[PDB]
Amino acid sequence: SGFRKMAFPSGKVEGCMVQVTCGTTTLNGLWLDDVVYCPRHVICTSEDMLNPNYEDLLIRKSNHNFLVQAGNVQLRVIGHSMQNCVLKLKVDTANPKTPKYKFVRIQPGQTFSVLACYNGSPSGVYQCAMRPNFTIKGSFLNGACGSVGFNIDYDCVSFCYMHHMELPTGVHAGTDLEGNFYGPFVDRQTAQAAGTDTTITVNVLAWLYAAVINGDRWFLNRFTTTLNDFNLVAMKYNYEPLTQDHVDILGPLSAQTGIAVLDMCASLKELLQNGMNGRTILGSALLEDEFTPFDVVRQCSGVTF
Amino acid sequence: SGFRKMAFPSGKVEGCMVQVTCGTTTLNGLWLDDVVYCPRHVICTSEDMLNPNYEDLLIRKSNHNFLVQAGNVQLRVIGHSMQNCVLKLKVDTANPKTPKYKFVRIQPGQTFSVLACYNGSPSGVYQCAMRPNFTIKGSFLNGACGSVGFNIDYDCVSFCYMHHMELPTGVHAGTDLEGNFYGPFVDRQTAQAAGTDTTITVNVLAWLYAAVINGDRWFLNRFTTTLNDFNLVAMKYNYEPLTQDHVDILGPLSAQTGIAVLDMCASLKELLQNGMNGRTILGSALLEDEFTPFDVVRQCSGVTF
Numbered sequence A, B: 001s002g003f004r005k006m007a008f009p010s011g012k013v014e015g016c017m018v019q020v021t022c023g024t025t026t027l028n029g030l031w032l033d034d035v036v037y038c039p040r041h042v043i044c045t046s047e048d049m050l051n052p053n054y055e056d057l058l059i060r061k062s063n064h065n066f067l068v069q070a071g072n073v074q075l076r077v078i079g080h081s082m083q084n085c086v087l088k089l090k091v092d093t094a095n096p097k098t099p100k101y102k103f104v105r106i107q108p109g110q111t112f113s114v115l116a117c118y119n120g121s122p123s124g125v126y127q128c129a130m131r132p133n134f135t136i137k138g139s140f141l142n143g144a145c146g147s148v149g150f151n152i153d154y155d156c157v158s159f160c161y162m163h164h165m166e167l168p169t170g171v172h173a174g175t176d177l178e179g180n181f182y183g184p185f186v187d188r189q190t191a192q193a194a195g196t197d198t199t200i201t202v203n204v205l206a207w208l209y210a211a212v213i214n215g216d217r218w219f220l221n222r223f224t225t226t227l228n229d230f231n232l233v234a235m236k237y238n239y240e241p242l243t244q245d246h247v248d249i250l251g252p253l254s255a256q257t258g259i260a261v262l263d264m265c266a267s268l269k270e271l272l273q274n275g276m277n278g279r280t281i282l283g284s285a286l287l288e289d290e291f292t293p294f295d296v297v298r299q300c301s302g303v304t305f
């Protein structure tokens, strides 16, 4: 037993990380087949970053202005193009460690592992949720751009995130691997609003299920509720509305525990209305919303890769 | 910026995990050079587990009774021995993916990454502290035994933990890679006490430093304290006594923030005495003690491997 925020094993992704240098600036890129993907702001200088004209800046660059290194292995760039906010550098050598992979644009509320990298070298790995407002709460320093987020299913790595920037609130923003930002963000050094961030209701319920499965059953009450009744309380506490689709997704966990979803909603409503009374749930004194239902089942059936 | 519980990249360790089967029982082993290390209870049946006579059980086993598989790669066992609570199986083939490595017996309060595995296949990775009472708060299901804990320094993997058992409290126990248990535990299915678990004071202070570095400065007060004064309060809240060695270890963080350690102790004392007032620090409504000073500096200078 036990329940922990658990990242995917990172080895398949470690093998794809490279260093990309364009003049002064170094950041990380992702080497898959004979293409290296990295944030297009690798081409910017200090002055450019307030409002870069990326098309103009990239025109001043040729293939030989991009230095790509995989460890000591120097790669040779034989073509470059910009797709949205990412550069694709065609290289002479196919990555021999390329995993089976897909590019996916993830939904808000879904989770993924981040391999934080500097200078093309892995630093560490952690789980993140794509927040409803299309930010993540990460840990990234200068040089971390081009670090990626991913999920693994069996043998297939689904890349969903590449890191580009930090917002004034200290939260993080980035793109999919086609270079489209999640949320309203643009890659320039301006103040940008993320807007209200709501709690992922279905994930909180998943985690309450996890907690019950792990012996914590004190928060359970003799009450039930309705979707409408609960959703009035959800809106009050800036929680996402719960839908029948959400109820359906929780079905496995509800069946495993024999606790009906609306009964867990009634539990959740009491927690929201009355706080925790200085008590804790799975080691936390707050309601946790970065575990999906899938996350909970995976960590209870022992799914491997 | 941002501060997250961050595991080491697991790829070097992924390459060493194998499946070990002895009759019915399967668990994980660690394949380094031409030796596979695994928990000795792989040789037990259901009946044996209350009080196994390991010496007698192992005598009934030969080399060919151990089936070791690395993926599909079958390995051939050419010798076996028991060292404390671990079996060492000599195999015909040296692991070609063996990292540079050391075996280390870790100190209480130090942290490490756990690669949770089932059937010799990696499931996920998370950070753990060795608690003062020599338990860890992990996430392990049936079949997880032989999963290992490690640290990485530059290119060298220091293995410090192998998983063996779960205690009645839901916490976890295991050995170093020489098979000696951390704490008073024995590998039999009996009720075993871990005893009082104290909070790792130096780690809480490290994390308060992390919090200040990341903008959270509300908990700071105009007060100071003395080591003796603080330690009277530490003992009251089941915190470890703070020593000058601890103060010395926090020196880098104190200098970086310009906050004196005893001033942070005064902050910590107020938090202990007056709770948090429903406020939060680096996303937590509790005092966090599983980040070492090293952990904090690593995640602020962007150390890579």
Ligand SMILES: *[C@H](O)[C@H](C[C@@H]1CCNC1=O)NC(=O)[C@H](CC(C)C)NC(=O)OCc1ccccc1
Pocket (backbone or CB within 6 Å): A027, A041, A044, A049, A140, A141, A142, A143, A144, A145, A146, A164, A165, A166, A167, A172, A186, A187, A188, A189, B001
């Ligand atoms: C790319 O490595 C870098 C990652 C930032 C740096 C600090 N924490 C992060 O996530 N991204 C940028 O520097 C980005 C470049 C623009 C052209 C998009 N600008 C940015 O994120 O500004 C915010 C910032 C906050 C704190 C320090 C530096 C920059």
Ligand SMILES: *[C@H](O)[C@H](C[C@@H]1CCNC1=O)NC(=O)[C@H](CC(C)C)NC(=O)OCc1ccccc1
Pocket (backbone or CB within 6 Å): A001, B027, B041, B044, B049, B140, B141, B142, B143, B144, B145, B146, B164, B165, B166, B167, B172, B186, B187, B188, B189
């Ligand atoms: C080895 O894979 C297993 C790991 C336990 C299983 C559940 N959570 C864990 O950490 N270790 C044992 O089964 C161990 C074997 C003895 C001979 C040492 N016994 C044990 O840990 O008993 C506690 C237990 C709790 C919950 C389910 C099963 C066993």
